[PDB]
Design a protein around this ligand. Structure first.
Ligand SMILES: CCCCCCCCCCCCCCCCCC(=O)OC[C@H](COP(=O)([O-])OCC(O)COP(=O)([O-])OC[C@@H](COC(=O)CCCCCCCCCCCCCCCCC)OC(=O)CCCCCCCCCCCCCCCCC)OC(=O)CCCCCCCCCCCCCCCCC
Ligand SMILES: CCCCCCCCCCCCCCCCCC(=O)OC[C@H](COP(=O)([O-])OCC(O)COP(=O)([O-])OC[C@@H](COC(=O)CCCCCCCCCCCCCCCCC)OC(=O)CCCCCCCCCCCCCCCCC)OC(=O)CCCCCCCCCCCCCCCCC
Ligand SMILES: CCCCCCCCCCCCCCCCCC(=O)OC[C@H](COP(=O)([O-])OCC(O)COP(=O)([O-])OC[C@@H](COC(=O)CCCCCCCCCCCCCCCCC)OC(=O)CCCCCCCCCCCCCCCCC)OC(=O)CCCCCCCCCCCCCCCCC
Ligand SMILES: CCCCCCCCCCCCCCCCCC(=O)OC[C@H](COP(=O)([O-])OCC(O)COP(=O)([O-])OC[C@@H](COC(=O)CCCCCCCCCCCCCCCCC)OC(=O)CCCCCCCCCCCCCCCCC)OC(=O)CCCCCCCCCCCCCCCCC
Ligand SMILES: CCCCCCCCCCCCCCCCC[C@@H](O)O[C@H](CO[C@H](O)CCCCCCCCCCCCCCC)COP(=O)(O)OCC[N+](C)(C)C
Ligand SMILES: CCCCCCCC/C=C\CCCCCCCC(=O)OC[C@H](COP(=O)(O)OCCN)OC(=O)CCCCCCC/C=C\CCCCCCCC
Ligand SMILES: CCCCCCCC/C=C\CCCCCCCC(=O)OC[C@H](COP(=O)(O)OCCN)OC(=O)CCCCCCC/C=C\CCCCCCCC
Ligand SMILES: CCCCCCCC/C=C\CCCCCCCC(=O)O[C@H](COC(=O)CCCCCCC/C=C/CCCCCCCC)COP(=O)(O)OCCN
Lengths: 140, 171, 122, 98, 83, 115, 175, 347, 105
């Protein structure tokens, strides 16, 4: 639910890094579970235990990405004494991309995910700061 | 949201009509002929007020009129009436048709002792008029005030200033 | 999401209310009408080209009917469009007039008293 | 709400789930579609009777009419599939992909 | 005239069931519109008092509404007894 | 509540008859005795093989004509309405399209069984 | 409260739905759907819907007879499956059963919003109306109104039935 | 199929759609959908073969599921308000169910799987019908209940539709599947602007229907359903391939062509409601549709593929049947951008 | 999208069946006829946006008549308190609530 997004965002930025890491890990795990559900539905895994293994793989990768991201971003914000700064989210996203690359064991995936995830996270931080709306309400 | 007001159990007391449905059905036609006035007053009250709490006195007059009617019947011929309603009561549908001799005797009895004429087919179902002193209720639905409408369209229609004004179009 | 569908006193399927007749009709040389006629002419030419007939010469009655149909429909299209824009402006002005506390007239300053920020280019 | 309403909505959800998760036979899925209609009939009838909307007593009959048309339509298609493959299995209809 | 004659002849000889069915269906369709009693049926249905006849508040301006059932005003069912 | 007691009584009586039939007599069941009956001999195939239905089209049509009955059963009550001309027109209209759908399938050889 | 008859009937309804949704052999699926149709007839009868209950029962009996014929014609297998002859069918059946059990428990011992809204129970009798009038059945009146009020509905349904006959003839033609 | 029967079935499809469009009662709208589906199943199987049978079977299953869900939403709405009028849904759960049912009827992602398969399985005439006329009813229903709908679910499905249309279209060589993925992306565009301005939805639908009719009629005229079969049309009918080239660029949304108008109008309306981000994604993603349109135009009109010897015999024969509205459709598909302010007549 | 052919021609194809307060056979009323009549008359002609705020009282009463959620809550509260006070013996139920009333016609 977006109650998970609120349990992530109700914690201040450079505070309680363990709690924020836990919240981001929960978000990542939910994402990985949904991904593995659709993957199992559209491409059957030929046996029950291979489906369980694919689920565990996807979910663990996603939760690890979330954990590394939340941990790195919260810690960087509190060390730099710089909340309200997209550089912390960039650092966290690039660390999460490196995590994904080490997981798939691919240097290209690692670098590409570092870059794109970091830029996306920095953009999300800028949108939180400026009030950008993804699903805008019908104002007029 | 407010307390519901209810009559006390004292104001709900009345001399009941404690005869069964066969007796009522055997008497129904003459009873509708004789006690028409208070019954119609009560039904008009009931359907204009839409509140049972506002028509208790009319209901008590209904009870007393029924009791007077049945007292007259008891005083002038209980035996033909008893014959008639026993015949009616035997039937599981309480059909008027299987008891025409008893009904004829009861009808002659009331016509000669009291001058009661049985209403003809189609008369008790007429919509009739009632004269009453009860003032016509003003807001029986207890409605709130209606919200005000939107103002209205008014004026002459002039062409839109500078046309459509879509990005670069001049018309 | 549906701004003008619910407007009061609107007939379901008119395409041209009677109030629209208080508006000036589009001139017959309206450039939008000329463009509609040009669309009809292009339809006639493509018609000739698809059926492997001479493109500019083959059916002159047919091309005339193409042009005439496009111009005829475009006239009424333009009438309805101009009428709808007139409705929009009418409603907007009436609403601004009836809600003055939402569209206030504040005193405007000359540039001599507004302090603007200067940014040197160097 | 009442316990009875909850049970009927549960029946609809179960039949919908049954329709969604296919096994081998097509006829079983057709049955699930019928089950959904049956639960819709019961639910609408309970709501209509409870609120005493008198004129709405005819809409469950219309519902049944259309349900019959859908059922007939489903059986025709099954006849043609079986004539093609000698079996009403879902797996056989994999000729067209995305 | 003579085409349809031999046609109905062949139909009565080969499919009397369909002949009788179309005759009965056509009669059922057309005869109700020529009957003087269809209106009697409508009136009989209208004279059946399913619900209570709610009385009207007398305002002194109702010359044609009865004030008692046995008063002469209002509808009459005399036509029904003799029917 | 009386109909529930009636149904319970009837089902109970039938079940008790089955119980008696199975527990009173002597039982001597062996494989030859319990084998499938096919007039002296062993069946060639299974009785669960597909059994072709040659009236498959009349069976689908029965589904649509059976719902015509649900639309015609309220007719005794519909006759009590005041606008009898609309009721009669509508009732007649419904049976006419039922006769036309029968005439359509009949003339298109839809009532003949598959060969 | 009182005898909770309709609660038992609706639970048996859900059980028959789990029976045929588990997707076993069609012979047993149609049996489950017949049981559901009968108990739904009973449910509706307990609320004053005699005609509608009896009608849905009749219609579904006819439909399931056609479906039995079609099952023997095209749905047969050497060993038709029952609810206990397969891990997949048995698992779906058990999961549906105890899912209904969990819903019913969580709903009747405390008051939870499952998906739409909440409920405490009390038995269905509380929401009745205590209305006292009439020489008729209001259900029968509303259904008879189809021929005087519902002209448009009669038109569209009759057209759809005729078109349905034409359509099945078109689909089953072959060539 | 007898011609009279085919006419009766087309008229029943259209009358079911019109019933959906003129009704005020939810039951009559449901009946319109039922009648439309009933008459539509035979039109898919008009030319009988196993692929047409499979396509009609997948179509029936999808649409009947959607129908059951739609009815359930109507009944829940009635339960929480004794209302049958189609205005604004009273219950949020009923609205979610209704939105998903109409998305399944339209083929929006993630319910998009059926559209390419059914379109590939049927003829070009049935594909034309399926991809043009079968959209009117659910879109009209969605336009009526637009205020009630939740923006987050609608916009999610719309963005998914655009993305999945582009990605799926990139992989196709069959023309019917290309048209189907194109349709999915276009539906995404139509539904993205729905919670803001239903007039933009109507305008997008009209322009999409015009371009799709033009494309399908051009594909029928040059009786091709694969890329390589369409690569021959230059050696028999060059005008047809040139017109198809220009129609393809209009579909891509490139200015000054008509196809660009709906995209332009939708982006502008969204920016008014303070929604810069969704539109930037939508346009950058429609670039994919433009790519595979350009690939088809490369193979069909801008270069010349090798041909066969038997084409010489076809050189000697004119087309037996001519489409009356094809010329008008091409002109409206390409040259209508200068008439954009005429959209005010749509509201 | 919605072409109002009924309103243009004055036909009444399906409007007779849209609401519960509209001309039932034999004048049989809906269970919530007055509440719906009130909510409809309160919100008529003011548009959808104003009607949801300015007629919320009538609609809340209408929904209470429809589903009776508050009534069941109040009854449950009363019966729980009765059960609790009876278990301890503090409260004794009256005879006319145990089956020994003097019934009246
Ligand atoms: C920031 C907030 C939260 C963000 C959420 C949004 C972001 C989502 C990103 C996920 C990306 C999905 C696709 C990319 C991965 C590739 C898929 C794959 O299988 O390869 C696995 C790939 C390598 O595996 P592989 O075995 O080598 O694959 C070999 C094949 O080539 C690969 O397998 P294959 O080729 O054999 O086929 C597999 C199959 C598998 O199919 C799929 O992948 C389905 C993808 C859907 C996933 C959507 C998830 C988003 C939901 C978020 C919910 C919020 C949570 C609360 O592919 C398909 O068939 C595609 C069919 C297309 C149909 C589409 C319809 C399905 C659903 C569409 C969207 C869902 C709609 C939901 C709502 C709908 C209602 C309107 O990498 C992984 O294993 C990683 C798995 C997932 C990693 C995601 C990272 C999560 C990071 C979260 C951090 C949170 C930080 C805290 C925030 C504060
Ligand atoms: C009002 C609207 C509401 C509507 C919805 C309401 C629904 C309520 C009704 C439900 C009651 C039951 C009714 C009966 C349904 C009929 C079932 C049926 O016919 O099955 C046919 C179907 C096929 O029949 P078949 O062809 O004869 O059998 C061939 C073999 O099955 C397969 O042959 P094979 O061995 O060669 O294939 C390998 C094997 C391989 O199977 C697998 O790979 C599955 C193994 C994955 C294990 C999951 C990991 C465990 C941990 C996850 C827990 C999450 C929280 C953990 C948090 C962090 C952990 C620290 O099978 C498969 O590949 C097939 C995939 C089937 C998987 C189950 C489908 C569910 C969606 C897919 C998700 C996959 C899991 C991802 C995780 C998602 C979240 C849990 O049978 C099955 O596939 C499974 C048996 C069915 C029994 C269970 C079904 C109940 C689930 C229904 C929905 C659940 C509730 C939804 C939401 C609830 C909230 C309100
Ligand atoms: C517009 C005008 C022009 C602009 C456009 C042109 C320029 C743009 C693009 C040009 C090239 C940039 C692309 C980046 C490289 C992509 C890697 C790749 O393709 O992987 C696929 C490719 C496929 O491999 P595979 O199939 O998976 O496995 C087989 C391998 O080949 C088998 O590999 P292996 O077993 O032989 O060994 C692999 C292993 C070990 O590799 C080796 O065996 C040899 C050691 C190589 C590492 C070199 C470290 C020592 C020298 C570094 C000096 C300090 C850096 C510069 C600072 C200067 C200070 C004033 O690699 C590692 O694990 C490295 C560990 C970490 C070291 C590198 C990461 C640090 C990032 C730098 C941060 C700088 C921040 C800004 C500083 C601010 C001041 C300006 O992987 C590789 O083979 C490449 C491995 C080496 C990659 C690291 C070198 C990157 C150099 C800096 C990149 C950062 C620039 C981008 C900035 C944006 C960041 C947000
Ligand atoms: C036979 C010739 C004839 O009867 O012409 C009489 C007609 C009489 O003209 P007039 O109203 O006395 O002259 C007023 C001025 O022209 C002053 O003209 P205006 O201010 O009345 O302009 C009318 C307005 C409205 O006019 C239009 O929307 C259509 C005009 C053609 C647009 C350009 C593309 C087609 C070439 O023009 C525009 O809004 C310009 C926007 C056009 C571009 C649309 C966006 C896509 C561009 C293509 C890339 O002259 C023409 O029709 C010239 C050809 C048109
Ligand atoms: C690619 C260009 C698109 C082409 C579109 C097809 C054009 C040919 C169609 C034939 C024209 C006749 C249609 C209308 C004739 C009379 C019917 C009239 O009464 O309809 C009215 C409505 O009028 C029509 O809607 C106007 C149709 C005009 C369409 C053309 C505008 C195209 C936009 C810009 C492109 C320029 C096109 C150039 C023309 C060839 C009813 O109003 P109303 O019932 O209350 O609204 C219903 C919808 N609501 C309620 C949801 C609002
Ligand atoms: C924004 C989120 C950032 C996501 C980071 C991952 C993006 C990686 C793309 C850069 C290219 C790296 C790469 O090597 O791609 C390959 C990689 C697969 O591994 P291979 O290298 O092919 O396997 C090697 C042995 N056969 O490509 C992929 O599968 C991923 C492609 C999808 C990228 C994600 C796009 C999601 C778009 C939807 C968003 C909503
Ligand atoms: C999130 C989604 C965002 C969507 C962004 C879409 C970008 C639009 C560009 C589409 C490129 C599609 C290329 C592709 O799919 O295949 C690569 C293609 C496959 O060849 P085919 O012709 O399909 O088959 C031949 C063999 N039978 O291989 C190639 O050689 C490609 C050659 C041309 C590539 C042109 C790319 C130009 C891109 C310029 C930069 C900007 C691109 C858009 C993204 C900008 C960055 C944000
Ligand atoms: C306006 C009245 C409408 C309402 C009444 C009808 C309601 C129900 C009756 C109609 C049911 C549908 C009838 C379907 C007709 C099928 C025709 C057909 O093809 O059958 C012919 C048989 O019938 C024919 O011959 C074809 C039509 C011939 C005429 C049939 C009757 C037409 C009307 C006759 C009476 C006209 C009106 C009555 C006047 C009575 C005289 C005063 C072939 O027989 P087979 O079964 O195929 O034989 C197989 C073995 N060889």
């Amino acid at each position: 639910a977006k109650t998970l997004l609120h349990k992530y965002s109700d914690i201040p930025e450079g505070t309680e890094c363990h709690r924020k890491a836990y919240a981001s890990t929960s978000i990542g795990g939910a994402t990985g579970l949904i991904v593995s559900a659709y993957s199992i539905a559209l491409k059957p895994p030929a046996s029950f235990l291979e489906g369980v293994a694919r689920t565990g793989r996807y979910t663990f990768t996603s939760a690890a990405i979330g954990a590394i991201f939340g941990l790195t971003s919260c810690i960087s914000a509190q060390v730099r004494e710089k909340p309200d700064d997209p550089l912390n989210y960039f650092i966290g996203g690039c660390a999460g991309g490196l995590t994904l690359g080490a997981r798939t064991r691919s240097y290209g995936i690692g670098a590409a995910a570092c870059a794109y995830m970091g830029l996306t996270a920095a953009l999300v931080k800028m949108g939180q700061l400026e009030g950008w709306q993804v699903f805008a309400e019908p104002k007029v | 949201p407010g307390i519901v007001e209810l009559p006390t159990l004292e104001d709900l007391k009345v001399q009941e009509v404690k005869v069964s449905s066969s007796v009522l059905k055997a008497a129904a036609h003459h009873y509708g002929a004789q006690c028409d006035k208070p019954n119609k007053e009560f039904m008009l009250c009931r359907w204009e007020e839409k509140d049972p709490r506002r028509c208790l006195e009319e209901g008590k007059l209904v009870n007393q009129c029924a009791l007077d009617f049945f007292r007259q019947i008891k005083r002038h011929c209980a035996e033909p009436f008893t014959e008639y309603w026993t015949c009616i009561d035997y039937s599981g549908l309480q059909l008027f048709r299987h008891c025409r001799k008893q009904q004829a005797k009861f009808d002659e009895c009331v016509l000669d002792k009291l001058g009661w004429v049985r209403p003809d087919l189609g008369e008790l179902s007429k919509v009739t008029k009632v004269k009453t002193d009860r003032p016509l209720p003003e807001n029986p639905y207890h409605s709130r005030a209606r919200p005000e409408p939107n103002p209205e369209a008014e004026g002459d229609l002039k062409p839109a200033k500078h046309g459509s004004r879509l990005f670069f179009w001049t018309m | 999401m549906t701004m003008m569908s619910g407007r009061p006193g609107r007939v379901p399927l008119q395409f041209l209310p009677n109030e629209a007749r208080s508006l000036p009709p589009p001139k017959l040389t309206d450039p939008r009408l000329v463009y509609m006629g040009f669309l009809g002419y292009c339809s006639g030419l493509i018609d000739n080209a698809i059926r492997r007939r001479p493109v500019v010469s083959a059916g002159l009655h047919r091309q005339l009917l193409y042009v005439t149909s496009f111009v005829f429909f475009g006239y009424y299209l333009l009438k309805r469009q101009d009428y709808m824009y007139a409705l929009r402006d009418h409603d907007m002005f009436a609403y601004v007039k009836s809600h003055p506390e939402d569209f206030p007239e504040k005193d405007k300053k000359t540039y001599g008293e507004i302090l603007e920020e200067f940014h040197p280019v160097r | 709400m009442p316990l009875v309403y909850m049970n009927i909505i549960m029946a609809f959800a179960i039949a919908l789930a049954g329709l969604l998760m296919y096994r081998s036979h097509l006829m079983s899925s057709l049955l699930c579609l019928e089950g959904m209609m049956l639960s819709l009939f019961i639910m609408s009838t309970l709501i209509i009777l409870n609120t005493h909307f008198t004129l709405a007593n005819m809409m469950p009959i219309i519902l049944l009419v259309f349900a019959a048309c859908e059922a007939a339509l489903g059986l025709s298609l099954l006849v043609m599939v079986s004539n093609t493959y000698g079996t009403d299995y879902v797996q056989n209809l994999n000729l067209l992909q995305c | 005239a003579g085409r349809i004659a031999s046609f109905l002849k062949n139909a009565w000889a080969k499919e009397p069931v369909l002949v009788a069915s179309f005759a009965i269906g056509g009669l059922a369709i057309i005869l109700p519109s020529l009957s003087p009693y269809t209106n009697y049926a409508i009136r009989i249905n209208r004279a059946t008092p399913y619900n209570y006849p709610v009385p009207l508040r007398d305002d002194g301006n109702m010359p044609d509404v009865p004030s008692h059932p046995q008063d002469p005003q209002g509808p009459s069912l005399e036509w029904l007894k003799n029917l | 509540m009386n109909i529930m007691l009636t149904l319970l009584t009837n089902v109970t009586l039938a079940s008790l008859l089955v119980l008696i039939a199975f527990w009173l007599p002597q039982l001597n069941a062996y494989s030859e005795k319990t084998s499938p009956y096919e007039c002296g001999f062993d069946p060639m195939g299974s009785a669960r093989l597909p059994f072709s239905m040659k009236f498959f089209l009349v069976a689908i049509t029965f589904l649509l004509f059976d719902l015509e009955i649900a639309l015609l059963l309220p007719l005794p009550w519909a006759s009590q309405t005041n606008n009898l001309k609309t009721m009669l027109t509508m009732a007649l209209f419904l049976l006419i399209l039922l006769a036309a759908s029968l005439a359509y399938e009949w003339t298109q050889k839809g009532l003949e069984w598959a060969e | 409260m009182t005898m909770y008859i309709a609660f038992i009937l609706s639970t048996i309804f859900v059980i028959g739905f789990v029976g045929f949704s588990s997707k076993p052999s069609p012979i047993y699926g149609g049996l489950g759907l017949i049981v559901s149709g009968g108990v739904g007839c009973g449910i509706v009868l307990n609320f004053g819907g005699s005609f509608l209950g009896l009608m849905v029962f009749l219609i579904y009996l006819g439909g399931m007879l056609v479906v039995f014929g079609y099952t023997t014609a095209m749905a047969t297998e050497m060993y038709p499956e029952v609810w206990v002859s397969n891990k997949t069918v048995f698992g779906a059946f058990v999961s549906g059963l105890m899912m209904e059990f969990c819903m019913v428990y969580y709903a009747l011992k405390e008051e939870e919003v499952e998906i739409i809204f909440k409920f405490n129970g009390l038995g269905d009798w509380v929401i009745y109306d205590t209305g006292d009038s009439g020489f008729f059945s209001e259900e029968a009146m509303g259904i008879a109104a189809l021929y005087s009020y519902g002209t448009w509905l009669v038109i569209v349904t009759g057209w759809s039935l005729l078109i349905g006959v034409v359509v099945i003839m078109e689909i089953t033609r072959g060539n | 199929m007898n011609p009279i029967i085919y006419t009766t079935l087309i008229m029943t499809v259209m009358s079911g759609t019109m019933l959906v469009m003129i009704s005020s009662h939810w039951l009559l709208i449901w009946i319109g959908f039922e009648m439309n589906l009933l008459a539509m199943i035979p039109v898919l199987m008009k030319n009988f073969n196993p692929r047409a049978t499979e396509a009609a079977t997948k179509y029936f299953l999808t649409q009947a599921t959607a129908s059951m869900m739609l009815m359930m939403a109507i009944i829940i709405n009635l339960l929480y308000s004794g209302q049958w009028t189609i205005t604004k849904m009273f219950n949020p759960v009923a609205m979610t169910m209704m939105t998903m049912a109409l998305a399944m009827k339209l083929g929006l992602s993630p319910f998009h799987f059926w559209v390419p398969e059914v379109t590939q399985g049927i003829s070009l005439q049935a594909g034309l019908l399926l991809l043009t006329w079968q959209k009117l009813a659910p879109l009209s229903v969605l336009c009526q209940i637009s205020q009630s709908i939740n923006p987050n679910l609608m916009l999610t499905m719309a963005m998914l539709s655009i993305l999945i249309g582009g990605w799926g279209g990139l992989n196709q060589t069959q023309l019917r599947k290309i048209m189907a993925y194109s349709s999915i992306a276009h539906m995404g565009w139509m539904t993205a602007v729905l919670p803001y301005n239903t007039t933009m939805t109507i305008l997008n639908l009209l322009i999409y229907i015009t371009m799709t009719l033009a494309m399908f009629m051009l594909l029928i005229h040059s009786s091709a359903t694969t890329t390589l079969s369409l690569s021959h049309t230059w050696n028999k009918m060059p005008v047809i391939t040139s017109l198809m080239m220009v129609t393809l660029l209009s579909m891509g949304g490139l200015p000054p062509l008509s196809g660009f108008m709906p995209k332009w109008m939708i982006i502008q309306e969204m920016t008014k409601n303070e929604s810069i981000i969704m539109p930037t994604l939508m346009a950058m993603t429609a670039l994919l549709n433009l790519y595979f349109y350009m690939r088809l135009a490369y193979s069909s009109s801008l270069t010349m593929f090798p041909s066969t010897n038997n084409m010489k015999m076809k050189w000697q024969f004119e087309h037996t049947k001519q489409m009356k509205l094809l010329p008008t459709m091409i002109v409206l598909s390409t040259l209508v951008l200068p008439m954009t302010p005429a959209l005010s007549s749509l509201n | 999208p919605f072409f109002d052919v009924q309103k243009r021609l004055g036909l009444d194809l399906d409007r007779w069946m849209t609401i519960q307060s509209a001309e039932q056979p034999h004048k049989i009323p809906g269970r919530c006829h007055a509440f719906e009549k009130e909510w409809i008359e309160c919100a008529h002609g003011i548009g959808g946006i104003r009607a949801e705020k300015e007629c919320k009282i009538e609609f809340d009463d209408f929904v209470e008549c429809l589903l009776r959620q508050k009534t069941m809550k109040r009854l449950s509260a009363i019966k729980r308190q009765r059960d609790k006070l009876i278990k301890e013996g503090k409260y004794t139920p009256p005879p006319h609530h145990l089956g020994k009333e003097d019934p009246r016609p």
